Each structure stands twice: as structure tokens, then as C-alpha cells.
Amino acid sequence: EFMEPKVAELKQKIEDTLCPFGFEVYPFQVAWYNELLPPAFHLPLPGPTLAFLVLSTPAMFDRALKPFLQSCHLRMLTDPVDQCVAYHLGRVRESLPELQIEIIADYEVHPNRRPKILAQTAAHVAGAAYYYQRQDVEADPWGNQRISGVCIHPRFGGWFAIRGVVLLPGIEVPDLPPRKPHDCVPTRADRIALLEGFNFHWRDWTYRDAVTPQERYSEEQKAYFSTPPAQRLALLGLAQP
Ligand code: CNC
């Protein structure tokens, strides 16, 4: 009846399940996501439907991936981190058994090769990380190249990843208050440098420092993500109990 207490209760339940393992949780309305998108990407839910954007902080690697590797057998052709994230998104269901919930991870792609969710658009409208796009630089320098956008977290910079959306059909919060993402890379020259670093130099990691981060990925975590996905899956499978 009154949704404000309901949103807080649901958020707290999801945070209790996910925050100990290195995730953060942000509510948004489905309408805010659909509003920005062409119909191919629309979530076919009523606009006031409550959703949650899930991202991983640097701590996810130690708090979730490492214990996961000790307890679960790795499947082929799926990155270990994606298997870990699928496991933890699955725990959200166990934590709300009396609700119909729908979960779409960042790694999910349609047979037509479109991603099932636009993770960066969800992160922006959930107020979690400003999504910096080519059109945020007027008269940008890149011409007729594809230039991908990039989200920057106000606490972690680019040292984070977007992991999924949790949708709660039937739970409608038309008055959920919009929380705008922090424009933490405001200047033109910094926006150009960020987009250049992400698009053409992302293997040197430096785009993630576009704001000073409270924490970075550990050198061990950086070793993992620096390793080609085929090799890291082969090596972790080799060493598993
Ligand atoms: C496919 C994909 C994806 N990738 Co890559 C990965 N892995 N990626 C790739 C590949 C191609 C990317 C591409 N084609 O653009 C490749 C090339 C495989 C790749 C590579 C990388 N990726 C990388 C990363 C980190 C990420 N990738 C994701 C973007 C990550 C995605 C995860 C996900 N599920 O979203 C991902 C699965 C889908 C991205 C996509 O297709 N978007 C392109 C297009 C469809 O979206 P768009 O450009 O934003 O356009 C929409 C918006 O503009 C929106 N819109 C319109 N008006 C507005 C107004 C506003 C205000 C807003 C907010 C939106 C809009 O509408 C448009 C659609 O019509 C990421 C969000 C995944 C994650 N966090 O788990 C993450 C970025 C995180 C961040 N800080 O933003 C890499 C560094 C490698 C890595 N470590 O994984 C590297 C970076 C180079 C690069 N060029 O991106």
C-alpha cells in the first residue's frame, strides 16, 4: 500500500544477501531505463516497476570469487567471474522466495548478439555511476570510429563492474525518487582523456583512475583480468580441488 517502506525492506534484503560479498545495490524505476532507449531494448514491464542495479566493488574478487573457486566446479566456455556472479544473483531469489523476480546479468546476450540489458544505462538511471558517452564531448576528436561509453563510480572510479539488474514484477513504485548520478568527471579535457583511455588504452588500466579511487583492484585481481579468458578458465580449472 505504502511503497516507501517496501522499497527499503526489499533493498535491505538484497543488500544483506549481496553486500557481504562485495556488491552494491541501487533501486530504479523501469520507466527511467526504457525512457532513454529504442524499443528493441525495452523491458516489457510496467514503467513504475521496481528494479535494482547490482555492481561489484574491488572487494568482490576476494570476498566472492576466491571462496567460490573452493566450492563450485567450473563449467566450460563461461568466465569464472560470470559463474560466480550467476551464483550470487541466484542467492537473491533464495532471499525473496515469495516474490516473482527476474534477473538479467551483464554477460547475457541474445541470439541476435544484442546484450539483454544495457548495464551502463541502468547504472546511470539508478544513480550508481555516471555513464560518459561520446555525445558528452561536443565536436569530439574521433570522427567515424565507434567510440564506446564508460561509467565512472564516484568512490571507485572505474575500479568496479556492473553485474546485473533484479526486476520485481508486480512491485510498482511510481513515486520512487530519482537520484541523479554524480557528474564526477565534469570537464571536457577529462572526458576526452577518459574516453580515449577506455577505447584505445584500456589494457593499461589508467582510465579507471579518472577519479581518485578509495580502493583499486588488487594486483592479484589485475593479474586475473589481464589474463585472456580462455587461459584463466583453463588455469583455474586445472588447480581446482
Ligand atoms: C559487448 C561488450 C560489452 N561490454 Co565491454 C565487456 N566485457 N565489451 C563489449 C565488447 C564491445 C563493446 C561495444 N560493442 O560497444 C568488447 C569490445 C567485447 C568489450 C570490451 C570491453 N568491455 C570492457 C568493460 C570493462 C565493460 N564492458 C561493458 C560495457 C560491456 C557490456 C555489458 C552490458 N550488458 O551492457 C557489453 C556486454 C555490452 C555493451 C554494448 O553492446 N553496448 C553498446 C550499445 C548497445 O550501447 P550504448 O553504446 O550504450 O548505446 C545506448 C545508449 O547510448 C542508450 N542511450 C541513448 N540515449 C541515452 C541517454 C542517456 C542519459 C543514457 C544513460 C543512455 C542513453 O541507448 C543506446 C542504444 O540505443 C561493461 C559495462 C561490463 C561490466 N561492467 O560488467 C564494462 C564497462 C564498465 C564501465 N565502467 O562502464 C573492457 C575494458 C574489457 C573488460 N575488462 O571487460 C573493454 C573496453 C573496450 C570497449 N570498446 O568497450
Swiss-Prot record:
Phenotype for residue 232 to Q: Reduced activity in dealkylation of methylcobalamin
Cofactor binding note from Swiss-Prot or TrEMBL = Can utilize both FAD and FMN.
- What broad class describes the main subcellular location of this protein? cytoplasm
Q: Which UniProt keywords apply?
A: Cobalamin, Cobalt, Cytoplasm, Disease variant, FAD, Flavoprotein, FMN, NADP, Oxidoreductase, Phosphoprotein, Transferase
- What tissues has this protein been observed in? Widely expressed. Expressed at higher level in fetal liver. Also expressed in spleen, lymph node, thymus and bone marrow. Weakly or not expressed in peripheral blood leukocytes.
Where is the protein situated, by its record's location annotation? Cytoplasm, Cytosol
The family this protein is said to belong to: Belongs to the MMACHC family.
- Know the name of this protein? Cyanocobalamin reductase / alkylcobalamin dealkylase
Organism annotation: Homo sapiens (Human)
List the lineage, top down: Eukaryota, Metazoa, Chordata, Craniata, Vertebrata
User: Corresponding gene?
Assistant: MMACHC
